[PDB]
């Protein structure tokens, strides 16, 4: 109970793009909404914090590609976090994303080019949150990991 | 008691001998590395939760040229970046980087094939290592301890 939080990260892209993170620290996460195309445009999320309420991050990154939607159920925690990234219209980008947890792997979204990325946790740990740094599209991503 | 985070590895998919510790880690006291072409061995001491001092490894071979870390006072581990890639017929980790909050260690090794980092944030400290290894490290990940 009220063990703190771990912040990795992020991957992608050294200096580009607007910082964006969560305020209240993150205890569960319930949803993505991925906006993707060639890249990787948009990232938002659903998670509770320490106090047990809800919060919307997001959107992190800018208006294009098309959305899914990924709503986790309450035995359902996300694993890891893996993609590529690399130059795309002159800054460095979130090229691809995929999503791993206990129960089903969600992607690859985007397109596979560039270079890997991937954060992987163990002992039944989740990843409960991300933070990173956007502008048209995720420049760099990264994750809160909470133990159990 | 909060559980240390355990994040990773990287590198090879499955080859090399698991390797971890046995008790939680509070505090990373040195690493020691074996390098040349690739890195060929890690130990590290660290201090437990209970304060006592516990040796991990070296874990890998026989082969490379000894660094030996030791961490100052208030010196602490905040990223472990590398590269991995094929080596006499295996993946490996072929160089390896310890930044800390007062210096940077490295790199060790030959900055060759996949890049991979894990940087720890909000003065959060990597505190400890796991891995894959033979004759050389084939996969490497790391302990997390947050303030």
């Given at each position: 109970e009220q063990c703190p939080v771990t912040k990795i990260g992020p991957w992608?892209?050294?200096?580009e793009g607007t910082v964006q993170d969560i305020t209240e620290s993150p205890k569960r996460l319930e949803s993505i909404t991925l906006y993707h195309g060639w890249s990787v445009d948009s990232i938002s999320f659903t998670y509770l914090d320490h106090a047990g309420e809800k919060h919307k991050a997001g959107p992190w990154g800018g208006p294009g590609g098309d959305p899914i939607m990924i709503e986790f159920g309450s035995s359902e925690f996300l694993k890891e976090v893996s993609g590529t990234f690399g130059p795309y219209e002159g800054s460095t980008v979130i090229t691809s994303i995929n999503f791993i947890t206990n129960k089903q792997t969600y992607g690859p979204f985007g397109?596979?080019?560039?270079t890997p990325f991937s954060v992987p946790a163990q002992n039944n740990s989740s990843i409960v949150g991300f933070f990173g740094r956007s502008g048209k599209y995720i420049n760099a991503v990264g994750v809160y990991v909470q133990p159990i």
């Open positions: 992608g892209s050294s200096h397109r596979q080019e560039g």
